[PDB]
Amino acid sequence: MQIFVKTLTGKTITLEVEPSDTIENVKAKIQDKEGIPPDQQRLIFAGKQLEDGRTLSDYNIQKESTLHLVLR
Amino acid sequence: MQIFVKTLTGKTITLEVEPSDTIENVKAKIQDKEGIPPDQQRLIFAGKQLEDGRTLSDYNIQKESTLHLVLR
Amino acid sequence: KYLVEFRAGKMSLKGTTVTPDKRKGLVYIQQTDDSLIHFCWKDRTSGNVEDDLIIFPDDCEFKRVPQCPSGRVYVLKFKAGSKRLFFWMQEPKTDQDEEHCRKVNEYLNNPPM
Amino acid sequence: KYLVEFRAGKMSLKGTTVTPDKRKGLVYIQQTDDSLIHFCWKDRTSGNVEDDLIIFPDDCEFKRVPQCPSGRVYVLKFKAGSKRLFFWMQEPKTDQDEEHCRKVNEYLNNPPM
Ligand SMILES: *[C@H](c1cccc(NC(=O)c2ccc(OC)cc2)c1)[C@H]1C(=O)Nc2ccc(F)cc21
Ligand SMILES: *[C@H](c1cccc(NC(=O)c2ccc(OC)cc2)c1)[C@H]1C(=O)Nc2ccc(F)cc21
């Protein structure tokens, strides 16, 4: 499935993922695409910071959902 | 009521308006706030360019709706 | 040229009853020189453009309608209002339906370059 | 300091039953030093922050729930999912309820500076 990742700078990322992908997996895909190391990434969806061990489906992240990426 | 006006490259504008305000009125409010002349403004909502003689309510623009502003 | 395109017809829920439009059509996305994204539908026979919507990120979702027995009914849904445009796929093959749906969403919600 | 604040309690739809939380509460919006916007609820008696949501533009709408006869029930609605947080106003006066609602939306969807 496809999701979008918005940043502060405002450039949005299109990612292809799976429902069973962990948040850690998604950060790894972001590193692959954008070169941002996972340990600098905060992913947020529906008001909450997403935990590495949990899946996209755990947070009910679906086809064409948008996540927010904040750099720390 | 409150609406938001997004621009292509720039900031979003918060406007206070009325349901009966014409699109021409809204462009005048944008001129008042931002100094952009009405004849340079294209307002878009739900896929369509908005006509000067019609009202916000005609287009079912409601509390806290977002319009898109494109500069000619 | 078109950034994305695929054969599809239009259709109306008149309420309870389901009225498909029989005409051969093409859904496509076009980026004009002002950089705006246009979601369009045209009649393939006449060439006339019937729908042309200027779409920005966060305006729209394009998704399959699960309730349709066909499996090839899709809706352009405006997230804010209740504006809905329904389409039925006319591509001879079905293997790219899900890909076409993803591409629509990509170019509407995050057009590259 | 708080960018927006007002007295309000929390409440749950348990399906078909309304369950109001009777505790004295404060809804507020706070912008932290990283510039992120936080929608919060705290217990005014204890001072404990129970809700703290990081909100961006186009995530949320804050609006009155018209079905509630009270007239002072508001919902923080996430446009994407089905996440809903309900609140009942506890301000002694009612004349700023609509203004408080506008201010929430302003700072969530278009925070100044
Ligand atoms: C879905 C729905 C239910 C029953 C029948 C149909 N019709 C078609 O899918 C169809 C028939 C024939 C042709 O070729 C001419 C094309 C398509 C559809 C309902 C639904 O649940 N939601 C919905 C929304 C919009 C619609 F137009 C129809 C449906
Ligand atoms: C609205 C609703 C319908 C019936 C009754 C109430 N209750 C309250 O307004 C209320 C009662 C008592 C107090 O303080 C003790 C506070 C508030 C509400 C429904 C609705 O239509 N949607 C909804 C959503 C969430 C809710 F909690 C209630 C409602």
Numbering used by the authors:
A (entry chain C), B (entry chain D): 1 to 72
C (entry chain B), D (entry chain A): 21 to 133
Task: Quote the study on this structure.
The 26 S proteasome is responsible for regulated protein degradation in eukaryotes. Its substrates are typically marked by post-translational modification with ubiquitin chains for recognition by ubiquitin receptors in the proteasome 19 S regulatory particle (RP). Adjacent and opposite to the ubiquitin-binding surface is a channel across the Pru domain where the intrinsically disordered extreme C-terminus of RP subunit hRpn2 binds. hRpn13 also has a DEUBAD domain that binds and activates the deubiquitinase UCHL5/Uch37. Proteasome subunit hRpn13 is partially proteolyzed in certain cancer cell types to generate hRpn13Pru by degradation of its UCHL5/Uch37-binding DEUBAD domain and retention of an intact proteasome- and ubiquitin-binding Pru domain.
Attempts to obtain crystals of hRpn13 Pru with XL44 were only successful when ubiquitin was also included in the mixture, yielding a structure of hRpn13 Pru:ubiquitin:XL44 solved to 2.1 Å resolution. Each asymmetric unit of the crystal contained two molecules of the hRpn13 Pru:ubiquitin:XL44 complex. As expected, XL44 was found to bind to a similar region as XL5, tethered at Cys88 by a covalent bond between this amino acid’s sulfur atom and carbon 13 (C13) of XL44 (insert). The electron density for XL44 was well resolved for the methoxybenzamide, central benzene and indolin-2-one rings, as was the thioester bond between C13 of XL44 and hRpn13 Cys88 and the surrounding region, allowing stereo assignment of the two chiral centers at C12 and C13 to R and S respectively (insert). Analysis of XL44 binding indicated that the XL44 indolin-2-one ring interacts with hRpn13 Met31, Val85, and Phe106; the XL44 central benzene ring interacts with hRpn13 Pro89; and the XL44 methoxybenzamide ring interacts at opposite sides with hRpn13 Trp108 and Pro40. Except for the backbone atoms of Gly35 and Thr36, the hRpn13 β1 - β2 hairpin spanning Leu33 - Val38 was poorly defined. The XL44 methoxybenzamide group buried into an hRpn13 hydrophobic pocket formed by hRpn13 Pro40, Lys42, Val93 and Trp108, similar to hRpn2 Pro944 and Pro945. Superposition of the hRpn13 Pru complexed structures shows translational movements of 4.2, 5.9, and 8.4 Å for the β1 - β2 hairpin upon binding XL5, XL44 and hRpn2 relative to apo state, respectively. The positioning of the hRpn13 β1 - β2 hairpin is more similar to the hRpn2-bound state for XL44 compared to XL5 and allows interaction with Trp108 as well as closer contacts with Leu33 and Phe106. The XL44 indolin-2-one ring is buried within a pocked formed by hRpn13 Leu33, Val38, Val85, Gln87, Cys88, Val93, Val95 and Phe106.
